[PDB]
Amino acid sequence: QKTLEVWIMPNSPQPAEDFKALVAPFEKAHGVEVKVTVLDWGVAWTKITTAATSGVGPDLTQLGTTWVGAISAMGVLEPVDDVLEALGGEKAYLPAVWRTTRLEGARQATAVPWFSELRAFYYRTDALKAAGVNPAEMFASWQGFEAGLARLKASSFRDPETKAPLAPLCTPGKNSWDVLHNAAPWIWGAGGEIVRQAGGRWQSALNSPESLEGLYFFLSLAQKGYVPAESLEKNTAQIEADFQAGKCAVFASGPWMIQRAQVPEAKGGFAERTAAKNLGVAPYPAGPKGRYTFFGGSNLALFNFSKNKPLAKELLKYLGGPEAQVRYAQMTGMLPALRSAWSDPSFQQNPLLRTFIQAAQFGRTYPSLAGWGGVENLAVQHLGMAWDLVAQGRLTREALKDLMDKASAAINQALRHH
Amino acid sequence: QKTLEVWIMPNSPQPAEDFKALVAPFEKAHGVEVKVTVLDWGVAWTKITTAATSGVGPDLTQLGTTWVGAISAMGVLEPVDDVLEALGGEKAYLPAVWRTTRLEGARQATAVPWFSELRAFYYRTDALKAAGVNPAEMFASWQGFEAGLARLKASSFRDPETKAPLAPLCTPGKNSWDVLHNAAPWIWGAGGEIVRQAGGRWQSALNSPESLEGLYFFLSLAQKGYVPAESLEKNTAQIEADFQAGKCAVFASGPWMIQRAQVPEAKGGFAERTAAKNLGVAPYPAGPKGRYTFFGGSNLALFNFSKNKPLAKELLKYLGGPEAQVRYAQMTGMLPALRSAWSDPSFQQNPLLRTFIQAAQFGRTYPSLAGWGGVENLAVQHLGMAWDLVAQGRLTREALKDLMDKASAAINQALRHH
Numbered sequence A, B: 001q002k003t004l005e006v007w008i009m010p011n012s013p014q015p016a017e018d019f020k021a022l023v024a025p026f027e028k029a030h031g032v033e034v035k036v037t038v039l040d041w042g043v044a045w046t047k048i049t050t051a052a053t054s055g056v057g058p059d060l061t062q063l064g065t066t067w068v069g070a071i072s073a074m075g076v077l078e079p080v081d082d083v084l085e086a087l088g089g090e091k092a093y094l095p096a097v098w099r100t101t102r103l104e105g106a107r108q109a110t111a112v113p114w115f116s117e118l119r120a121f122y123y124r125t126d127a128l129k130a131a132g133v134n135p136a137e138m139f140a141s142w143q144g145f146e147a148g149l150a151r152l153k154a155s156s157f158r159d160p161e162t163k164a165p166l167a168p169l170c171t172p173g174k175n176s177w178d179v180l181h182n183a184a185p186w187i188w189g190a191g192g193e194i195v196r197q198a199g200g201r202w203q204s205a206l207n208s209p210e211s212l213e214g215l216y217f218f219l220s221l222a223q224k225g226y227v228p229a230e231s232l233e234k235n236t237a238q239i240e241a242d243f244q245a246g247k248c249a250v251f252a253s254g255p256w257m258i259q260r261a262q263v264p265e266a267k268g269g270f271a272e273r274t275a276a277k278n279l280g281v282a283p284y285p286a287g288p289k290g291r292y293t294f295f296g297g298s299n300l301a302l303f304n305f306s307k308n309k310p311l312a313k314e315l316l317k318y319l320g321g322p323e324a325q326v327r328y329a330q331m332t333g334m335l336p337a338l339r340s341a342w343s344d345p346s347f348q349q350n351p352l353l354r355t356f357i358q359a360a361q362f363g364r365t366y367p368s369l370a371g372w373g374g375v376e377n378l379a380v381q382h383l384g385m386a387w388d389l390v391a392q393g394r395l396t397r398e399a400l401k402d403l404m405d406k407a408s409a410a411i412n413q414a415l416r417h418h
Ligand SMILES: OC[C@H]1O[C@@H](O[C@H]2[C@H](O)[C@@H](O)[C@@H](O)O[C@@H]2CO)[C@H](O)[C@@H](O)[C@@H]1O
Pocket: A011, A041, A063, A064, A065, A066, A067, A117, A176, A177, A178, A236, A254, A295, A296, A297, A298, A376
């Protein structure tokens, strides 16, 4: 009759149902009830920070890897070094994954790695073929990326269901954390970054010459008509929905879309759509200073005001452990956080998934900072205003610089305090 | 083993679960399993129009009242006059609800009323009291509304959980259908409208002198600092989340927030929050040409490519009928569509809900037109750009007029399209 409450984000298309089937064996072996509540990504920051400040909430909460340091810095998370030792310690994890178990420079781990994700480009094989585009040259370089989009815009190809052209590229301009995650590769590729350590402190680098170069190149794809105006007002889920509906030739996303492509519309997938029958993946192109993609995922954290700490730690060890690592990655189409589970043969057979796995050497993420929640909110707000400059025909290098100088002022405030 | 597929939007905090409990009796009596799929509002237009164009989808779909004419005019909906006759016909419905059963001027009804919904202002009793605001004066007139917001801005009141001031008003500036529904009362209150019958056709009126007056007054609340810049990039979900979290003194919503306030976070509500303990409702203020609010909701439609039409009509008769009408309104915090069901004490004994029932006198909606889905997408896009003028310090009457001239040209295209 002993019970646990868990907060999760929508990691699969039937998230509560998938999470319940995942924990059913643990419920049987301990004779306990695990309750699950689903928080949309757009409101999860608001709801998790309120639970933290109020001292009331669940036993466990999913945390995006980029939030672990920001929640940890509030002093509301129970140490989980014991759980991670029981899962095989530092050596069981990719160094980049291990760094998401804590606030940078904290002694104690405060989250357990649950799943990994990184970004690549999904494209329509039938569209790039009709346009005469070589996917290998389109996704090899900025120049190539731009040339491929120009061909996709000039193409007379029409989706056989919609009977209408495809937008060359769709990217979300509003409301998602992905307004930051989708700009990051371009910034990094130009030799830029989101933040930089100097003058003793962390500050915004979104106004560095190289950051402006990468961000401007990204924004100018919309300026040139490769991204439709409508896309700049939309969020992640809508861009996913536009691709599934046969309206976009190319978009940036995570390994989950592969799982969706294999499942019917009734189960929140798109197996019956033209796009699922014509699905390609290519990595992010090399920029002038490097080849990068966003690498992230989600960890599980235990609030220090939980009344069932020993039982919730047993559940973290279960979810962080090999068997649940494999089953949840299968249900979600995410990559296991436990490095050993990448080698499970169920992940070796899928050709599109292999593209994601082998793209991981280009994966980069943000330092695990106390101000990071604020940085992401302000980044989403200010980058969405840069997309606005395009919708208005007002995008210039000076206007972008002025806007990123204001984003930088505000981000510097957030890195001092909450 | 007979099957039905039903598409619904997230009407309650656990939508699929609540919908399965609602249809359980019908499943038992008929030996059918009803499969439900949840479509977020932001992607429902995309997924419903793709089902229409492809001839592949569910048996039934939820349709927002403002979309019924638009989907009907695509030639894909079954007539349901038999179901509405069996539910008691034109007399069993509010005239405004009856008009949402069809495309304007069509012989045959193509949707069954499911639930009703109209807009009012939620406010924080504790905030208006600390600010010295008389709710009765604040929600009586535009001048009153503005005077109350000036007092809310000046207040040194801090939310007891956040330890921080409350924004006087939050409204979503992006990527919700509510960007239109939140503007419409201000437009209508100035004596404007969204569209106007102009010489044998329908056309945009967003660029009429009175429509600009109403919209300009609305936007200028944000110009004066009554709405934070942050709010202008956010969608309806985030604004609701911000109110629940104690960040907003006032916001416009539906009757569902009353149900949400009575349910804990773990079931998708906000009973733990200060805002649930300090909840007031007031009507939209009278504009200079009178008092108006947005009156809508959702109906249920049967695709004419369904293979299960006789059974799906029995399910429509069930969902539209007295018992299920009461149950779903209880679970969702919506008003029943069937007038007779308003008599249940769950509605008539609910003092916050009584403000929504009384607000129904002043309820207005859009004509039931062929291009209406297009009108809403384009309206949301262009109204999002009006909010942008504010964020940028570029709001002038000419700039707003130029923007609504472009919204009007685009909307005219969508209305004349065959
Ligand atoms: O910065 C927020 C976290 O985002 C996570 O990615 C989410 C994304 O935000 C959602 O929009 C959705 O599409 O799913 C993604 C995968 O769960 C990211 O994985 C985390 O590392 C970030 O902390």
